[PDB]
Design a protein around this ligand. Structure first.
Ligand SMILES: C/C=C/C(=O)C[C@H]1CC[C@H](C)[C@H](CC(=O)NC[C@H](O)[C@H](C)C(=O)NCCC[C@H]2O[C@@]3(CCC[C@@H](CC[C@H](C)/C=C(\C)[C@H](C)O)O3)CC[C@@H]2C)O1
Ligand SMILES: Nc1ncnc2c1ncn2[C@@H]1O[C@H](COP(=O)(O)OP(=O)(O)OP(=O)(O)O)[C@@H](O)[C@H]1O
Ligand SMILES: [Ca+2]
Ligand SMILES: [Ca+2]
Ligand SMILES: [Ca+2]
Ligand SMILES: [Ca+2]
Length: 361
């Protein structure tokens, strides 16, 4: 066939699909399972998830960086052959990487696409910058927060400013774990692997960011107005009250999970302050949120409040939170891969043959 592919590999989820679609058609867990003793060769994604229990399950991307290459090769095979139902040798493939991904790492991605999958052409794009593009901008500061890592990435005239990038190893998995902890403290039992998945769903369905933590805690202590009932698959019902906003509060106050790090408002400010003073105005007016961990209701308003408190009193602050932002990286990749002016930028199989891996730089 013909259509270019966009594969946005994350710590928790693979988002894959065809350039020109408006969302990824294949979204599945970035997990590879190989047989346990009871099992007695490899499974990926939803099937791995459902056959977990007779598999040893591994995440090949850790905090946004590919670390297990053999399992990553399995992910990509499943992506092409099982999910997209394509022959990879027939489709140019755009892949994504984390900010500050080592050069040796982008090179191994490239070596594998060509030497294992025989793709005709490929490209590796930085995730946060693709999210900025998806919002129609070439200058701004992205907060990209997923399952495994959070970054602040200031971007000027199309390209990230690497000296000002901030990485925080606090993201959605840590929030899921903390929700599990605080639900356990309330008296619920969430221990099994099935139960951890339930907690992730609760997080995604019911959590939100309070505008002011203390005020919200006081409302929750004196009223039922913030309570929600959540129905488990087996029919059991639990009440979630202040856990709804205590969970994502950790993004702003990482001390809730024992981390000494600055919160996401502070890392955003600190990143802007590492940039030339003459571009800061434009960064402040173009803070784009990306990634599943930015999906909490209330997060934009809270960011607005917190950045306003840190920034000069006359600064225009604007937080942009696209509704599609679980998929902003992928959408930016799709938009980019379609541009007429991008077609020259693909690395072709023939160019790889002459130069070797470092051509991707
Ligand atoms: C000159 C230096 C280049 C570098 O890559 C240096 C690196 C060194 C390391 C440093 C950390 C930084 C990294 C970086 O930002 N890389 C680029 C990044 O991967 C993005 C996704 C990309 O590949 N982007 C490629 C964009 C290619 C497009 O570039 C343009 C110019 C720049 C802005 C870009 C905007 C494309 C989007 C899809 C369109 C939008 C937002 C319209 C305006 O709505 O178009 C013209 C068309 C062209 C096809 O920059
Ligand atoms: N509505 C929501 N509310 C809160 N969290 C959400 C919501 N939807 C998804 N998430 C969380 O977003 C995360 C997945 O987001 P995303 O796909 O951007 O991450 P990733 O790319 O796999 O990881 P990373 O970018 O950290 O490598 C998960 O932790 C998931 O639970
Ligand atoms: Ca991601
Ligand atoms: Ca307070
Ligand atoms: Ca703290
Ligand atoms: Ca200057």
């Amino acid at each position: 066939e013909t259509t270019a592919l966009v594969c946005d590999n994350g710590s928790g989820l693979v988002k894959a699909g065809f350039a020109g679609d408006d969302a990824p058609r294949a979204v599945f867990p970035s997990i590879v399972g190989r047989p346990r003793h009871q099992g007695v060769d490899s499974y990926v994604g939803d099937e791995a998830q459902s056959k977990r229990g007779i598999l040893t399950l591994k995440y090949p991307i850790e905090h946004g960086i590919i670390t297990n290459w053999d399992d990553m090769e399995k992910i990509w095979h499943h992506t092409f052959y099982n999910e997209l139902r394509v022959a990879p040798e027939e489709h140019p493939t755009l892949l994504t990487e984390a900010p500050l991904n080592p050069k040796a790492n982008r090179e191994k991605m490239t070596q594998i696409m060509f030497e294992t999958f025989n793709v005709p052409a490929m490209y590796v794009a930085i995730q946060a910058v693709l999210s900025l593009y998806a919002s129609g901008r070439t200058t701004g500061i992205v907060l990209d927060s997923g399952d495994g890592v959070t970054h602040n990435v200031p971007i000027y005239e199309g390209y990230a400013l690497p000296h000002a990038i901030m990485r925080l190893d606090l993201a959605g998995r840590d929030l899921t774990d903390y929700l599990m902890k605080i639900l356990t403290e309330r008296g619920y039992s969430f221990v099994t692997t099935a139960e951890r998945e339930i907690v992730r769903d609760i997080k995604e369905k019911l959590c939100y960011v309070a505008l002011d933590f203390e005020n919200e805690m006081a409302t929750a202590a004196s009223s039922s107005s913030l309570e929600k009932s959540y129905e488990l698959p087996d029919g059991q019902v639990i009440t979630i009250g202040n856990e709804r906003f205590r969970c994502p509060e950790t993004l702003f106050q990482p001390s809730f999970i024992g981390m000494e790090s600055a919160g996401i408002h502070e890392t955003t400010y600190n990143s802007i302050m590492k940039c030339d003073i003459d571009i800061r105005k434009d960064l402040y007016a173009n803070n784009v949120m990306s990634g599943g961990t930015t999906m909490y209701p209330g997060i934009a308003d809270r960011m607005q409040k917190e950045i306003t408190a840190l920034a000069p009193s006359t600064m225009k602050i604007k937080i942009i939170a696209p509704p599609e932002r679980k998929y902003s990286v992928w959408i930016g990749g799709s938009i980019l891969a379609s541009l007429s002016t991008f077609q020259q930028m693909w690395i072709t199989k023939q160019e790889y043959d002459e130069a070797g891996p470092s051509i991707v730089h």
